[PDB]
Amino acid sequence: KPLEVIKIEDGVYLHTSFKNIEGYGLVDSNGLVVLDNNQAYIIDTPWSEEDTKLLLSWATDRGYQVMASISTHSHEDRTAGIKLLNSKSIPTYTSELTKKLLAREGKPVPTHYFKDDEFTLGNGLIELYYPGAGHTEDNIVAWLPKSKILFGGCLVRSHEWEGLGYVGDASISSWADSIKNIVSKKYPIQMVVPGHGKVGSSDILDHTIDLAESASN
Amino acid sequence: KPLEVIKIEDGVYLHTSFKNIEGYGLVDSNGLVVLDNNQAYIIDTPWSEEDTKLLLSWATDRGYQVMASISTHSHEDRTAGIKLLNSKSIPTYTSELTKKLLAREGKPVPTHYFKDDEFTLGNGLIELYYPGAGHTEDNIVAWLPKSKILFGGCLVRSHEWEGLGYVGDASISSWADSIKNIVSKKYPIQMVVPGHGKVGSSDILDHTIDLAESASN
Numbered sequence: 001k002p003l004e005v006i007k008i009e010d011g012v013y014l015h016t017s018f019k020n021i022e023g024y025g026l027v028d029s030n031g032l033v034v035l036d037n038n039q040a041y042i043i044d045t046p047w048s049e050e051d052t053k054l055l056l057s058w059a060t061d062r063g064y065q066v067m068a069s070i071s072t073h074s075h076e077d078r079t080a081g082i083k084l085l086n087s088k089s090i091p092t093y094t095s096e097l098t099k100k101l102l103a104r105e106g107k108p109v110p111t112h113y114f115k116d117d118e119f120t121l122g123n124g125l126i127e128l129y130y131p132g133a134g135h136t137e138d139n140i141v142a143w144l145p146k147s148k149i150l151f152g153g154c155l156v157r158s159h160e161w162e163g164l165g166y167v168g169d170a171s172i173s174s175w176a177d178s179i180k181n182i183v184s185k186k187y188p189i190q191m192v193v194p195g196h197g198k199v200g201s202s203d204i205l206d207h208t209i210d211l212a213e214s215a216s217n
Numbered sequence: 218k219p220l221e222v223i224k225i226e227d228g229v230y231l232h233t234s235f236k237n238i239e240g241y242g243l244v245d246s247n248g249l250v251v252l253d254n255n256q257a258y259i260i261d262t263p264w265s266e267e268d269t270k271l272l273l274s275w276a277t278d279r280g281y282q283v284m285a286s287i288s289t290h291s292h293e294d295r296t297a298g299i300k301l302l303n304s305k306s307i308p309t310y311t312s313e314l315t316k317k318l319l320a321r322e323g324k325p326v327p328t329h330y331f332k333d334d335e336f337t338l339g340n341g342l343i344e345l346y347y348p349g350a351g352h353t354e355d356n357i358v359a360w361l362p363k364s365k366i367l368f369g370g371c372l373v374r375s376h377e378w379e380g381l382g383y384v385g386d387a388s389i390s391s392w393a394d395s396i397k398n399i400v401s402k403k404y405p406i407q408m409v410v411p412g413h414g415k416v417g418s419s420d421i422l423d424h425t426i427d428l429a430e431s432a433s434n
């Protein structure tokens with residue numbers, strides 16, 4: 001089932017990829033391609049490397065220069081596409097914690113990494129933020145000040161789910177505190193993109209907190 | 218997370234292995250071990266070679282002789298262990314169809330297969346039956362006369378699922394007739410074991426038909 005790419009705002013594109021199988025259904029995962037003129041920035045590589053190659057095709061066929069990718073944590077729906085992009089000399093970005101954590105697992109690692117809780121890419125275009133542990137110890141989010149879109153990755157859950165889902169890496173205890181750190185940025189969010197499922201509004205934050213305290217208590 | 222093996226009837230054990238999905242959570246997969254004095258029969262291998270190692274150890278730590286396995290269709294949650302069992306000269310069986318589908322896909326093959334719609338293992342202990350396509354073109358079921366258990370594998374869905382699961386290799390329109398054919402055998406079904414989810418009663422068959430007619434439209 002091949003990659004899908006669609007525009008969700010000027011210079012912002014949603015890519016959805018489909019990994020499946022072995023007696024479970026089809027799972028979808030989302031990331032973005034964010035444009036500043038001809039220059040593209042990828043947020044979370046497609047699951048597989050064959051779909052990541054297609055995403056790179058989508059970009060360059062349209063004459064886009066792919067400046068960098070950013071992964072939102074060490075798990076593979078966000079990552080191991082990092083290997084391919086490295087092989088092409090395209091800068092791959094994560095948090096330091098994430099880079100170290102990928103190394104500990106002997107998995108391929110980004111060539112670039114940022115050190116504190118905040119970091120900006122594209123000269124203003126993409127603001128990254130580590131709010132604390134949640135779905136994973138290292139999950140970050142990305143804020144796009146132009147389109148007023150927050151990419152929540154698996155730190156958040158679309159309205160279509162009713163369970164945080166996977167928590168083996170998680171800190172249900174601390175999840176609620178992390179989303180609140182997000183709400184504290186007071187981003188003027190007009191849209192949230194989850195790692196899985198459907199794009200929605202700012203209300204996805206509240207719904208996520210709804211499920212984090214439901215599972216602590 | 219490790220295989221679980223639990224007694225569900227005299228001489229019948231449910232083995233359940235787990236795989237963990239991206240932001241969705243834990244998915245389980247069931248098979249059975251059927252004992253006959255101290256001879257043991259594996260109906261579906263666990264979902265991975267390591268969980269298959271653990272099942273064989275469970276058996277042999279109890280003084281059981283693992284006589285054979287049978288796989289209910291060609292997919293991984295049913296056949297992952299086939300390579301391992303082959304390397305220990307444990308006879309492995311599938312239907313003729315399942316075998317040729319595995320060989321077509323470059324996957325290791327059972328060392329034995331049956332040609333007809335009906336077959337038996339363990340000399341009547343395990344009755345097999347191919348009732349037509351459903352979840353796959355090749356799915357078979359296992360009837361256990363003594364315990365009165367029907368192992369329906371992925372041809373059936375337990376009550377807690379309100380979908381049909383992965384349908385990219387399914388025959389949605391033949392699915393209902395195929396369940397119908399199982400009913401026609403007039404097995405005094407006491408428990409239905411699904412490939413995923415909880416063990417139930419013969420209700421599971423009606424539920425499954427329901428879901429199947431539904432998707433048909």
Ligand SMILES: [Mg+2]
Nearest residue numbers: 234246248263
């Ligand atoms: Mg199993």
Ligand SMILES: [Zn+2]
Nearest residue numbers: 023292353371
């Ligand atoms: Zn299957």
Ligand SMILES: [Zn+2]
Nearest residue numbers: 075135136154
């Ligand atoms: Zn994750």
